[PDB]
Amino acid sequence: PNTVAPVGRLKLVKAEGNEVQRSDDGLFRLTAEAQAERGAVLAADPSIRI
Amino acid sequence: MISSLWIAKTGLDAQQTNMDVIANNLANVSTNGFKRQRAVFEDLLYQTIRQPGAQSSEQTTLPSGLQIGTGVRPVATERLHSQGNLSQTNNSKDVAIKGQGFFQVMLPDGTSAYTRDGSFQVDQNGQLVTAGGFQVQPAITIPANALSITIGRDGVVSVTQQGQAAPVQVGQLNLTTFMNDTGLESIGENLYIETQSSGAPNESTPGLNGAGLLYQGYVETSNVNVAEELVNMIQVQRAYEINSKAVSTTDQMLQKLTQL
Amino acid sequence: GAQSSEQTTLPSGLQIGTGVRPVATERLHSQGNLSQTNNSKDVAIKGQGFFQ
Amino acid sequence: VMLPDGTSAYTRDGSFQVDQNGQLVTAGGFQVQPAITIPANALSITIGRDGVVSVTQQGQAAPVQVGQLNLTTFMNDTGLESIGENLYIETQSSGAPNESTPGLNGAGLLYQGYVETSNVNVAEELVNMIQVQRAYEINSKAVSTTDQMLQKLTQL
Amino acid sequence: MISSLWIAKTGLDAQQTNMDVIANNLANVSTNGFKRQRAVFEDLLYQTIRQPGAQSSEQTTLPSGLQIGTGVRPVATERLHSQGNLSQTNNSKDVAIKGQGFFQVMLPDGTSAYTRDGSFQVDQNGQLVTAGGFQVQPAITIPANALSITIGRDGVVSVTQQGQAAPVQVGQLNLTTFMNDTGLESIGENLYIETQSSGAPNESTPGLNGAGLLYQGYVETSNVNVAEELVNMIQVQRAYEINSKAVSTTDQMLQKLTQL
Amino acid sequence: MISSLWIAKTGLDAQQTNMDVIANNLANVSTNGFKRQRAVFEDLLYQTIRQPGAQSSEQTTLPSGLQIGTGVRPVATERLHSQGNLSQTNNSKDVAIKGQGFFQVMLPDGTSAYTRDGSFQVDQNGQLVTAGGFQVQPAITIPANALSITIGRDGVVSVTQQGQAAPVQVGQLNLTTFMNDTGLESIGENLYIETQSSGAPNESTPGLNGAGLLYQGYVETSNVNVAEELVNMIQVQRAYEINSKAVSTTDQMLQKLTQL
Amino acid sequence: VMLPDGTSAYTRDGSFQVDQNGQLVTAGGFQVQPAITIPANALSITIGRDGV
Amino acid sequence: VSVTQQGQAAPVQVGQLNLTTFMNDTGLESIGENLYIETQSSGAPNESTPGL
Amino acid sequence: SFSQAVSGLNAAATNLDVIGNNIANSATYGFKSGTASFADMFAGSKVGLG
Amino acid sequence: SFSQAVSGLNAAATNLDVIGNNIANSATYGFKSGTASFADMFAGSKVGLG
């Protein structure tokens, strides 16, 4: 048991909810304003806890 | 269907086994050369929900993860191969071994057992058999018209005939010692059979290589201490009652869930 | 002594007794004390033997 | 103690026996790591207060030393993982074991003839089980009330 | 989930530890130089629902606010350091100290402990040791061919030789006194070790500065009064029963509540 | 299951050992050259709930912490080598030793044992042996046609021959001494052997280096004071019953607890 | 476990019985693949912690 | 907080567990794992030794 | 504890039997008085056996 | 209470032994009679030790 080793880290994003639109398959994506103001892809923030 | 029921069942079974060995010790307190038994317990496996020491952040780790038990299981029983007390019988054919070792006994099928209960009788052929008909392996043959039988400390047996003004040797007693006394398997006639745990037997005359001496006219009593057995019985009863209480509590909560 | 593993064997197994039974009642053919009765036909033997 | 697969575990239960090879093993066959061996025809095995093991013999007038029971200490005892057979193994949560003689560097001492019991308080278990039974019943009642109000809602 | 339940738990625990110290005192009633123990309890914190002395109006104040208890806890245990009765063994190597003091003992590790049990032996090297091999710190070495050993009221010790027709001094049994005897930490083998709340030890000769004298041939018995222990056992049994009744009442009340 | 129960069990065991040594002393009250036994106990470890002398605050310290005992153990069982009373048997083959020392004896295996009782006989071959067939180590051989055997205060032995009216010397009886007489390992048939606890034996002629003298025609009785055994037995019975009462009280508390 | 049609299936339920030929089989008649056989006149059967 | 060593009689101090207080404890924002974080409704925390 | 007491009782009975036999055979011509000698028995150390 | 009584009993036994020694030593030419001397012992005050 003393050989546990990290093998990666998830990417969590924080979207307010007024700038995300559902796709046609159940997934959510940034809208035009959201991607314009926060870049093409969001950056993971350490404040998110799971 | 609840883990608590399964755990409490194992607890009750362990207490039952302990009470069983206590009662077995209490039964033959009058058996010559009987050794008490003690049961040792050991818990079962564990279910790990959260692995201890796993990372909880980039730098912190869980000091101790979630880990649930599964119950208890008896693992072994040990015979207290101590020295029992010696009682006098004034019977010339009763021999008590003081120290370590066993008398070898030739079973009817041809195998060999080992006994510490020294109470010998002579059958119609002159053989020095044990109580039960099995004869001692070195084949001591007592001749007729024997006034008395003398067995020395070094296990040399001689008889006093009508004349000759000197006893004549008729055989010798040899004692076998084992590496692990507690390892022998008992078969239920004050007899133990050699098994893999105990080493190979090696005969030795009394008084050599740590083997005990022989006293004629004495018999070794069982080393059972009833003063401890009574307290053990009290503790066993209380533990059984507590486990039954746990079973009852689990049943009550299951019934309440059913009524939901 | 069971082969509990490839190399380790249990030093002592699990065995439960089933009680105790009497096996024999042996007589002690020792010599009793002799007494005096001063009777013509009272005979006591010292040692071994039996009248038939 | 040493498991058959080479790895080493740790235990508090001192109840030892001797196998056919004269090696001090636990009740279960696992041998103690410092490899204490007992010679043949031993008369009395004595264990010192600081782990030294001596044995008497037939004609010898002095005990002969046969081994030492050095024991390990951990930085965090609670972090050890507990495997079933009354054994513990070290984890990353606990520190690396450090082996030492008894009585030094905060290590304990050894008593021969006695075995450590279990530190389970009976009087607390019963009240705890009463408490958990009552809490279980209360939560069941909460479930029942939620079910009834949901049924009333969906009935209309 | 009820305050009464957690209060009754503390009450039960207090009664249990009281019974435990009573049993410990009754156990070693024959141990030489054993000082009995008694436990001191204190109540836990109080919840102030309404503040005492609060201004109840423009002129009035609350005589006493609403305060609720929380339970009990054992706060300490103290050993009554009185003088035990002296019994006679007619043994030249038994010393009983009358008064206050402790013999200093050199532990094998290198630390020094202090003991009250005066019952000494001589090892193979001719050094005075306690029952257990720990040597007396002043390092008294009794020479061989010692006809007799005499220890006076003070600490001087002499040995009578075959010749010279006069005793010869071979050491002195200085004993240590403490500012606070109860503050000594107790370990096994009838030994105490210095702590912060005990003060620095004070070496002294017997009979000076309040140090007691030494009697040879006597041994000090434990100061345990079984007549008080029996009534203590009755009292703790009744208190445990009362607390158990309180637990049962709370359980019944909660069970009847949860049937709605 | 309860610490009180285990403590009381240890107390019961200690009282049982005390009663056993009392019975052993009383049984061989008439054995020549027997030394009575005495058992010494000590307290077991202590569980420290609150460390004494702990730093309670920035400037306040606990005068005495919370410590709980866990029982009593018999640390040792030692002989009391006093000088037994000298009897008058007016026999020529029994010698009593006044002071210290032991007679040396050659065991059958080949080692050396030591005895205190002097009551000798002659084997069929003329050797001077103790009761049991063990000959004296210096091998004193009594010749035939011996009128009388004389032993002085020293070890010198003489035999009055039939003729020549001039006694001759046929050996000497030296005595062995030990640094620690209580460390001798006692065995059966009234014998002792050397261990590491006792010192290396040293030979000495009687009356030299503190060794005792020899008296012919006297025998040494056991130093068992039958007067003290009765009162010790009464005390043992009382203590045993009190510990049994403690066990009963603990069982009552457990039974009341389980009735919830 | 060896199925009748040759294929092999994997089971975690341990409840084994001895067949007429001695082969260890599962409750239902399907036999264990490693083909462990038990001789007759056997006093007692033991199974090690590492499957011996 | 103090810890007693092996040989040393006097305990050695290793640290102080001072604790914080707030002007309005109700306004703390609760998250998982029994944790509270400061908000604008609760005043700035102040640290102090216990009992003062 | 019981067996040691039994052994001591038997030893005392034997001694008294010897005394009675000696006192009964008084006035016999070719008679020599008999005496009894006892011996302790230990298993190891601290374990008396009567 | 046991210790005081036992100590007194031992003192009485010692006195009786001395008296027996004196009476049995009569007709010994170079002999002087022996007499025992006793002393009470107190721990502090109001506490008896025998």
For residue F126 the two structure tokens come to 């003329």
| CB proximity list for A4: less than 8 A, separation 6 or greater | B51, B53, B54, B55, D92
For chain F, the chains sharing at least 3 beta-carbon pairs closer than 8 angstroms are: B, D, E, H, I, J
From chain D, pick out residues whose CB is under 8 angstroms from the CB of E247: 127, 130
Q: Cα–Cα distance between B99 and E206 in angstroms, integer?
A: 50
Residue F142 CB coordination number (10 Å): 17
Q: Transcribe B125-142 into DSSP letters.
A: TSBEEETTSPEETT--B-
Q: Cα–Cα distance between I46 and F74 in angstroms, integer?
A: 11
From D106, which residue of chain H is nearest by alpha-carbon distance? H6
| CB proximity list for C39: less than 8 A, separation 6 or greater | none
**Distance of residue D90 Cα from the nearest chain A Cα, in angstroms:** 7
Q: What phi and psi values does residue F38 have, to the nearest 5 degrees?
A: -150, 130
Interface residue C23 vs chain B (CB under 8 A): yes
Residue B19 CB coordination number (10 Å): 17
For residue E97 the two structure tokens come to 């100290």
Burial (Cβ within 10 Å: 0-12, 13-18, ≥19) of residue E163: exposed
Interface residue B226 vs chain I (CB under 8 A): no
Q: Cα–Cα distance between F63 and H19 in angstroms, integer?
A: 27
- The DSSP secondary-structure symbol of B162 reads S
Interface residue D122 vs chain B (CB under 8 A): yes
Q: What phi and psi values does residue F157 have, to the nearest 5 degrees?
A: -120, 145
Selection from E20, E18, E68, E59 nearest residue E41 by Cα: E18
| CA distances (Å), origin F164, targets A28, F152, F168 | 135, 21, 10
Residue ranges with strand state E in E63-146: 67-68, 72-79, 86-88, 95-98, 103-106, 112-115, 120-122, 128-130, 135-136
Q: In the structure, do chain J and chain A come into contact, i.e. share 3 or more CB pairs under 8 Å? A: no
Q: Which helix (H) or strand (E) holds J9?
A: helix J2-24
Residue F52 CB coordination number (10 Å): 27
Q: Cα–Cα distance between E190 and F42 in angstroms, integer?
A: 6
Q: What phi and psi values does residue B187 have, to the nearest 5 degrees?
A: -115, -5
Q: Cα–Cα distance between G2 and G28 in angstroms, integer?
A: 12
From chain B, pick out residues whose CB is under 8 angstroms from the CB of F188: 98, 213
Interface residue D105 vs chain H (CB under 8 A): yes
From B34, which residue of chain C is nearest by alpha-carbon distance? C20
Q: Cα–Cα distance between E2 and D134 in angstroms, integer?
A: 10
From B88, which residue of chain I is nearest by alpha-carbon distance? I7
Q: What phi and psi values does residue F154 have, to the nearest 5 degrees?
A: -75, 180
Residue E243 CB coordination number (10 Å): 22
- The DSSP secondary-structure symbol of F58 reads S
Q: Are E123 and F197 in contact (CB under 8 A)?
A: yes
Q: Cα–Cα distance between E152 and E206 in angstroms, integer?
A: 10
**Distance of residue J43 Cα from the nearest chain F Cα, in angstroms:** 23
For residue F82 the two structure tokens come to 């006093």
From chain F, pick out residues whose CB is under 8 angstroms from the CB of H9: 53
For residue H14 the two structure tokens come to 């290793």
Burial (Cβ within 10 Å: 0-12, 13-18, ≥19) of residue D50: middle
For residue D126 the two structure tokens come to 């019963």
Interface residue B186 vs chain C (CB under 8 A): yes
For residue B151 the two structure tokens come to 């067995």
Q: CB–CB of D41 and B75 under 8 A?
A: no
Cα three-residue angle G19-G20-G21, rounded to 5 degrees: 90
Q: Which helix (H) or strand (E) holds B185?
A: strand B185-186
| CA distances (Å), origin D5, targets C7, D9, D10, D11 | 10, 11, 15, 17
- The identity of residue B231, as a single letter, is V
| CB proximity list for E256: less than 8 A, separation 6 or greater | none
Q: Which of F41, F63, F260 sits opposite E180 (nearest CB)?
A: F63
For residue B170 the two structure tokens come to 């008729």
Q: Are I34 and I40 in contact (CB under 8 A)?
A: no
* Alpha-helical runs (H) found in chain F: 3-27, 226-258
- The identity of residue D96, as a single letter, is A
Q: Transcribe H1-52 into DSSP letters.
A: -EE--SS-SS-EE-----EEE-S-GGGPEEETTTEEE--SSSPPPEEE-TT-
Q: Are E46 and E18 in contact (CB under 8 A)?
A: no
Q: What phi and psi values does residue E224 have, to the nearest 5 degrees?
A: -125, 130
Selection from F76, J47, F15 nearest residue E223 by Cα: J47
- The identity of residue I42, as a single letter, is F
Q: CB–CB of A4 and D92 under 8 A?
A: yes
Q: Are D50 and D66 in contact (CB under 8 A)?
A: no
| CA distances (Å), origin H48, targets H14, H27, H40 | 18, 20, 21
Selection from B216, B105, B94, B92 nearest residue B154 by Cα: B216
| CA distances (Å), origin F229, targets E217, F18, F223, F225, J12 | 18, 11, 12, 7, 16
Burial (Cβ within 10 Å: 0-12, 13-18, ≥19) of residue B69: middle
Q: Cα–Cα distance between G30 and D34 in angstroms, integer?
A: 47
**Distance of residue H51 Cα from the nearest chain E Cα, in angstroms:** 14
Q: Cα–Cα distance between E188 and F70 in angstroms, integer?
A: 10
Residue F50 CB coordination number (10 Å): 15
Q: Cα–Cα distance between E85 and E224 in angstroms, integer?
A: 10
Q: Cα–Cα distance between B35 and B38 in angstroms, integer?
A: 10
Q: What phi and psi values does residue D36 have, to the nearest 5 degrees?
A: -80, 120
| Residue labelled with tokens 């390092």 | E139
- The DSSP secondary-structure symbol of E134 reads P
- The DSSP secondary-structure symbol of B55 reads B
Q: Are G16 and G25 in contact (CB under 8 A)?
A: yes
* Half-sphere exposure for E212 (CA within 13 Å, toward CB): 21
| CB proximity list for E59: less than 8 A, separation 6 or greater | none
Q: CB–CB of A1 and B51 under 8 A?
A: yes
| CA distances (Å), origin E131, targets E199, F40, G16 | 27, 8, 60
Q: Which of F46, F66, F78 sits opposite E76 (nearest CB)?
A: F66
From F10, which residue of chain B is nearest by alpha-carbon distance? B228
Q: Cα–Cα distance between B22 and B14 in angstroms, integer?
A: 12
From chain E, pick out residues whose CB is under 8 angstroms from the CB of F48: 185
Q: Transcribe chain D into DSSP letters.
A: -B-TTS-B-B-----EEE-TT-BEEETTSPBPTT--B--TT-S-EEE-TTSEEEE--SS-SS-EEEEE--EEE-S-GGGSEEETTTEEE--SSSPPPEEE-TTSTT-----SS--------HHHHHHHHHHHHHHHHHHHHHHHHHHHHHHHHHH-
Selection from F185, F155, F181 nearest residue F169 by Cα: F155
From H5, which residue of chain D is nearest by alpha-carbon distance? D106
CB environment B73-95: b (16+ within 10 A), e (fewer): bbbbbbbebebbbbbbeebbbbb
Q: Are F177 and I31 in contact (CB under 8 A)?
A: no
Selection from D108, E86, E31, B228 nearest residue F44 by Cα: E31
Q: Cα–Cα distance between F150 and F157 in angstroms, integer?
A: 6
Q: What's the 3-state SS for D32-49?
A: CCCCCECCCCCCCEEECC
For chain B, the chains sharing at least 3 beta-carbon pairs closer than 8 angstroms are: A, C, D, F, I
| CA distances (Å), origin F67, targets E74, E78, F52, I14 | 11, 9, 8, 54
Q: Cα–Cα distance between E5 and D129 in angstroms, integer?
A: 12
E41 has which bridge partners?
E74
Q: Cα–Cα distance between I8 and F31 in angstroms, integer?
A: 10
Residue D63 CB coordination number (10 Å): 20
Q: CB–CB of J3 and E87 under 8 A?
A: yes
Structure resolution, Å: 3.2
Selection from B148, B147, B128, B130 nearest residue B138 by Cα: B128
Q: At what angle do helices D122-155 and E3-27 cross, to 10 degrees?
A: 160
Selection from J6, D105, E224 nearest residue F69 by Cα: E224
Q: Which helix (H) or strand (E) holds E151?
A: strand E148-151
**Distance of residue C5 Cα from the nearest chain B Cα, in angstroms:** 13
- The DSSP secondary-structure symbol of F259 reads T
**How many whole angstroms from its chain centre is CA D142?**
42
Q: Are E120 and F78 in contact (CB under 8 A)?
A: no
Kind of pairing, strands D45-47 and D52-55?
A: antiparallel
**Hey, is E77 helix, strand or coil?**
strand
Q: Cα–Cα distance between E138 and E128 in angstroms, integer?
A: 10
For chain H, the chains sharing at least 3 beta-carbon pairs closer than 8 angstroms are: D, E, F
- The identity of residue B239, as a single letter, is A
- The identity of residue F19, as a single letter, is M
From E185, which residue of chain H is nearest by alpha-carbon distance? H9
**Hey, is E158 helix, strand or coil?**
strand
Q: Which of C8, C10, C11 sits opposite D4 (nearest CB)?
A: C8
Interface residue G12 vs chain C (CB under 8 A): no
Q: Are D89 and D9 in contact (CB under 8 A)?
A: yes
Q: Cα–Cα distance between E204 and E176 in angstroms, integer?
A: 6
Q: Are F5 and D123 in contact (CB under 8 A)?
A: no
| CB proximity list for E48: less than 8 A, separation 6 or greater | E65, E66, E67
